[PDB]
Amino acid sequence: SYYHHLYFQEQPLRLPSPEVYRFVVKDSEENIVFEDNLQGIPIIKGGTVVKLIERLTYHMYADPNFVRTFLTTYRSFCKPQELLSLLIERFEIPEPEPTDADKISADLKRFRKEYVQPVQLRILNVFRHWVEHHFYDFERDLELLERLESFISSVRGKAMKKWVESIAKIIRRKKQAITFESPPPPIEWHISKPGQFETFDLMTLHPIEIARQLTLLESDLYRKVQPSELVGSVWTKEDKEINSPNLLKMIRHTTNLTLWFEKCIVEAENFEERVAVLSRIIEILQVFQDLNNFNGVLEIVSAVNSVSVYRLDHTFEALQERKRKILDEAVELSQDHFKKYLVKLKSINPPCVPFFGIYLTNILKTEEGNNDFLKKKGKDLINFSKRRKVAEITGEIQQYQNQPYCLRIEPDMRRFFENLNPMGSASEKEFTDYLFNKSLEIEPRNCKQPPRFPRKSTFSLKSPGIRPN
Numbered sequence: 001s002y003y004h005h006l007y008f009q010e011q012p013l014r015l016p017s018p019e020v021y022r023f024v025v026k027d028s029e030e031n032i033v034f035e036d037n038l039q040g041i042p043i044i045k046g047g048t049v050v051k052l053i054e055r056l057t058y059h060m061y062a063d064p065n066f067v068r069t070f071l072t073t074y075r076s077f078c079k080p081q082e083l084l085s086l087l088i089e090r091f092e093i094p095e096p097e098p099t100d101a102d103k104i105s106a107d108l109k110r111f112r113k114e115y116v117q118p119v120q121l122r123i124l125n126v127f128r129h130w131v132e133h134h135f136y137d138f139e140r141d142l143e144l145l146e147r148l149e150s151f152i153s154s155v156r157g158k159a160m161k162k163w164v165e166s167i168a169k170i171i172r173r174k175k176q177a178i179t180f181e182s183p184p185p186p187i188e189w190h191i192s193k194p195g196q197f198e199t200f201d202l203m204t205l206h207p208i209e210i211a212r213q214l215t216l217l218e219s220d221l222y223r224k225v226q227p228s229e230l231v232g233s234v235w236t237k238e239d240k241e242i243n244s245p246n247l248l249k250m251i252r253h254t255t256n257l258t259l260w261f262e263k264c265i266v267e268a269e270n271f272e273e274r275v276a277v278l279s280r281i282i283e284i285l286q287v288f289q290d291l292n293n294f295n296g297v298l299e300i301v302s303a304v305n306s307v308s309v310y311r312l313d314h315t316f317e318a319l320q321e322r323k324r325k326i327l328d329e330a331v332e333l334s335q336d337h338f339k340k341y342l343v344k345l346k347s348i349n350p351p352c353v354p355f356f357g358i359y360l361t362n363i364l365k366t367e368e369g370n371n372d373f374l375k376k377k378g379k380d381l382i383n384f385s386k387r388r389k390v391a392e393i394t395g396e397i398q399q400y401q402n403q404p405y406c407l408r409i410e411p412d413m414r415r416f417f418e419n420l421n422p423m424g425s426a427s428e429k430e431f432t433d434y435l436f437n438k439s440l441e442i443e444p445r446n447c448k449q450p451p452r453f454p455r456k457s458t459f460s461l462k463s464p465g466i467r468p469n
């Protein structure tokens, strides 16, 4: 009564009624649309969530690319509990009502072999991919895992036991949860010595080791970001702390470090000390560059572009020309929408830390420039092509996440950079206003030379340089 729709048309497969199994409703413009201008598997443009689930577990062929993109992006259109219920509903396939003749027929044998078993195995593959690559869904919702484990314990049949045991094995391993191929260089120390963590500061630590330790820290933060933290702009929305925890740590580290570089410059009231502070920051930038940490490079560029720093003409003119040329070459990476940076990224060799902000910007642009739904007369369809476009960008982020640095962690220095709090008790607005007022104090408008302020420390301003020892 219901049927599934090259050089010969074979007999149609008989299916159960949609009244008892939602997924066999005929495809139409009102429930699924394909990228027909794009090219063996048809590319899904959008559909109802029921049709997306049907195609996620399609009986005719496997679709690994859709499975991957779906499981990365589905939270922007479907809740995890809802997804599990839909997959279970998909699994529990009723057989077509036997005709007066059946009351095993050839049609029913076809149905179990061509439809039921393939769809059920597709679902088990989706479960496997789900727990393998998105197990945080199950850490975040213990009931979701209980439902899944209970369901797979109900799956009968020798043919499916190996899939069930493969899923259970992954769950087992997930619930349970540094070597060097060549010797990392010795940790570098300047004025602050090992263990003296209360004296740690921008000018007392070694500029080489500041850049190394910030690079190890930023590499770790970058590596831990999952693509679903970026989908649907969830890191800016209500539940951001639950849905984007690693992304937020990355963003907040960058905010704090950029403000700290600004603070170090503007609070150096003594002119010669401030020029030495800026010069040291440029040396840290150089080492970031040597390490291919372009996140760190552009954090420093961002800091010197802050108004309170940028307006310090006397400080930039007092820089050695050699320091000026290094700074300005890095600033030019960012110009014309990061043209030169993007050329450099495509050519570098690992390990590296890419500039994270450009991905965030491109995802926000894509989220804003595409509608979540395709508009229909009846129920509007989920715009899946939008999610694919976002997944393309998150796929780029992941290329650089398995690239460890041959550098030794310094635990005290790592804690120092994890605990930076340049704002004190000020709000961001208060702190920004404070920095600008301090800028005005240390280089007043139209001063022909900066006023004299006392030196802040009694140490040499001389850098140890960026040659490793």
Ligand SMILES: C[C@H]1CN(c2nc(Nc3ccc(O)cc3)nc3ccccc23)CCCN1
Pocket (backbone or CB within 6 Å): 304, 305, 310, 311, 312, 313, 316, 317, 324, 327, 328, 331
């Ligand atoms: C004279 C500038 C001062 N300045 C900067 N100068 C330079 N380079 C520079 C070239 C020639 C020179 O004689 C001295 C410095 N690089 C920067 C990089 C990041 C932020 C600001 C600046 C800030 C205001 C613009 N006017």
